[PDB]
Amino acid sequence: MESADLRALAKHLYDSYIKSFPLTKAKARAILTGKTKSPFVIYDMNSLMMGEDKIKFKHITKEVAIRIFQGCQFRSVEAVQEITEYAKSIPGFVNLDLNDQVTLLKYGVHEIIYTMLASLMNKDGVLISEGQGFMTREFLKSLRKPFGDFMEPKFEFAVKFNALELDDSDLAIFIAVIILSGDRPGLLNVKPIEDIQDNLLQALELQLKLNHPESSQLFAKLLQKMTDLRQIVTEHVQLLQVIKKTETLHPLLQEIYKD
Amino acid sequence: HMESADLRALAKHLYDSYIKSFPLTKAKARAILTGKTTDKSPFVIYDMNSLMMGEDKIKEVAIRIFQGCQFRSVEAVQEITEYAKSIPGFVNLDLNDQVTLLKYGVHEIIYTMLASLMNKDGVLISEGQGFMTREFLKSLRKPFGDFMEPKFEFAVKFNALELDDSDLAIFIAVIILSGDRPGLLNVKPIEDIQDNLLQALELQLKLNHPESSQLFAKLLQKMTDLRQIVTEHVQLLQVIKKTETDMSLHPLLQEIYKD
Ligand SMILES: CS(=O)(=O)c1ccc(COc2cc(C(=O)O)ccc2-c2nn(C(=O)c3c(Cl)cccc3C(F)(F)F)c3ccc(Cl)cc23)cc1
Ligand SMILES: CS(=O)(=O)c1ccc(COc2cc(C(=O)O)ccc2-c2nn(C(=O)c3c(Cl)cccc3C(F)(F)F)c3ccc(Cl)cc23)cc1
C-alpha cells in the first residue's frame, strides 16, 4: 500500500465519520472549553427535573437514578444504529459474510461506545443531547447504591483516553480498527477481516505520524488502550448483570434493550 | 422527494437487515416447498400417527399445536423487534411511540411473513424441517380448527402478488411506521419516515416488477385485509380463553393484546 492509497482511505473514513455521528469531537471540545449558546447544566435532582421539561428527552414514560440509567440505555441503542451505519463505509466491510458482519458489530459496539463517549466527556461532566446539555460528573458519581459506581468508571476511562489528545480524523480510523477485530468469537472466515484491519492499522499508523509528529510512539500507546478497553467492557456487563437481579420494565421494551 | 440513488440505498439497507434478522427467508422457503431437492426435504405431518413420529424426527393435540404457535409467535416478535431497530429513524422516536408502533404492528407482520411459509396445502414448521398440511389443522376440534385456516386463506391471496424478500423487507418497514396507531404522541415524524419508505417501496416494485400493472397500489390495498384479520384473530383468541381455562398466554403476547 503506497502512501497515496492510505491517505485516501483516511479521508474516506473521516468524511463518513462526520456524516454518521451527530456530535463530533471538535464541536464537543469547543462547547466544553467555552469557545462557542451555553448548554443547560444538570448538577442535582431539581435541575434534571427542569431539563426534562425543557430539553424534552425522548426516553421518558419512576425513581431518579433509574431514569438516569435508562436514558443512557436509550442513547446507547441510538449509537448502535449509528456505528452500524458507519461500518458500511469501511472499504471491504459490506463484502463480508453476513454472519461475520453481525458478529463484528455485536462484539465491537460496547468498546466503540466507550471510546466515543470520551469525546463528549471531561474531568467534570458530560455533554448530552447533541451538545445542548451538560450533566455534571459530581452528580452522576453521587447517585445511590449501584447506580453511582456504574457511572464513574466511564469518566475515569475518558480522562485517561483524552490525554492522548486525538481528533476526529484519528478516531475515524481507530474506530474502524476496533470493528474489524478478527478474534471475535464465532467468526467463520477470519482472513479477510484481518486483511482489512492490517489495512486500517497501516492507515492509522501514518495518520498519527503526520497529524502528531511530536508525539513519540503514539500509535503504540493508543493500541495499548484497546487493551484497557477490553477490561472496562467486561467490568461493564458484570455490572449490568448485577443491576438486573436487584433493580427493574415493559415486555416489549425488554426486547429492544436485550443485550 | 429523495433522489433515486438515495432510495435504492434505503432498499439495500433494509433488505440486508431483513436477511440478518429473520432466519427462514422466503427464497429458502420456496426452495423447500417446490422440492426437487434431497437435502432440503420436509417431514410432512398429516395425522396423529405422523405427529407422534415427526416429534422424534423434526425435534391433547390441538392444545399442544396451539401452544407451539404461541411459542413460535414470541420468537417472531423478537425477530421483528430487532428488525425494527434498524429502520432508519425508528430508534430516535419517542420511546412510547416505539412501543406503540410495535404493539400494533407485530401481528400484521407475522401474518405477512407467515404467508412466505405457506402454499395452498400447508405450512413449514421448525425452520423448514417440518410441514403441516392445512387439512389437518382445519380438522382440529372445537374452536381450534377454525383458528388455523384464515391464515391459509389470506396467505393464498397475498402470495399471488409474487413478492420476494427484497420487496417484503420494505413493505414490512412501511407497516411498522404507521402514523395512525392509537396513542402515538408525535405523528408527524412517524409519517416523515413512512413517506420515505413508501417512496422506497414504489421504486423497488417498479424496478423489480416492471411488468406488474399497479403492483404498488395493489400491495398497499393488502394492508386493508391485514387490519381485518388481526381483528378476527384477537376476537377468536378472546373466545377460546373463555372456553379453555387451562391455557396460558405468554407475557409478551399477553402485553400486546391487552390494548
Ligand atoms: C440522565 S439522561 O437521560 O439525561 C442522559 C442522557 C444521555 C447520556 C449520555 O450517555 C451516553 C451518550 C453517548 C453518545 O452521545 O454517544 C454514548 C454513550 C452514553 C452512555 N452509555 N452508558 C452506558 O451505561 C453504556 C455504555 Cl458506556 C456502553 C454500552 C452500553 C451502555 C448502556 F447501554 F448501559 F447504556 C453511559 C454511562 C454513563 C454515562 Cl455518563 C454515559 C453513558 C447521559 C444521561
Ligand atoms: C404444532 S408445532 O408446535 O409443531 C407448530 C409450530 C409452529 C407453527 C407455525 O405457526 C406460525 C409460525 C410462524 C413463523 O414460523 O414465523 C409465525 C406464526 C405462526 C402462527 N401463529 N398463529 C397464531 O395463532 C398467532 C399469530 Cl398468527 C400471531 C400472534 C399470536 C398467535 C398465537 F399466539 F395465538 F398463536 C398461527 C395460527 C395458525 C397457523 Cl397455521 C400458524 C400460526 C405451527 C405448528
Curated annotation (Swiss-Prot), chain B:
This is Peroxisome proliferator-activated receptor gamma. It comes from Homo sapiens. Highest expression in adipose tissue. Lower in skeletal muscle, spleen, heart and liver. Also detectable in placenta, lung and ovary. Phosphorylated in basal conditions and dephosphorylated when treated with the ligand. May be dephosphorylated by PPP5C. The chain holds residues 235 to 503 of 505 of the full protein. Interacts with FOXO1 (acetylated form). Heterodimer with other nuclear receptors, such as RXRA. The heterodimer with the retinoic acid receptor RXRA is called adipocyte-specific transcription factor ARF6. Interacts with NCOA6 coactivator, leading to a strong increase in transcription of target genes. Interacts with coactivator PPARBP, leading to a mild increase in transcription of target genes. Interacts with NOCA7 in a ligand-inducible manner. Interacts with NCOA1 and NCOA2 LXXLL motifs. Interacts with ASXL1, ASXL2, DNTTIP2, FAM120B, MAP2K1/MEK1, NR0B2, PDPK1, PRDM16, PRMT2 and TGFB1I1. GO terms for cellular component: chromatin; cytosol; intracellular membrane-bounded organelle; nucleoplasm; nucleus; receptor complex; RNA polymerase II transcription regulator complex. It is found in: Nucleus; Cytoplasm. It is linked to Defects in PPARG can lead to type 2 insulin-resistant diabetes and hyptertension. PPARG mutations may be associated with colon cancer. Obesity: A condition characterized by an increase of body weight beyond the limitation of skeletal and physical requirements, as the result of excessive accumulation of body fat. Rosiglitazone binds at residues 70-73, 107, 233, 257. Belongs to the nuclear hormone receptor family. NR1 subfamily. A motif (9aaTAD) lies at residues 251-259. GO terms for biological process: BMP signaling pathway; cell differentiation; cell fate commitment; cell maturation; cellular response to hypoxia; cellular response to insulin stimulus; cellular response to low-density lipoprotein particle stimulus; epithelial cell differentiation. The gene is PPARG.
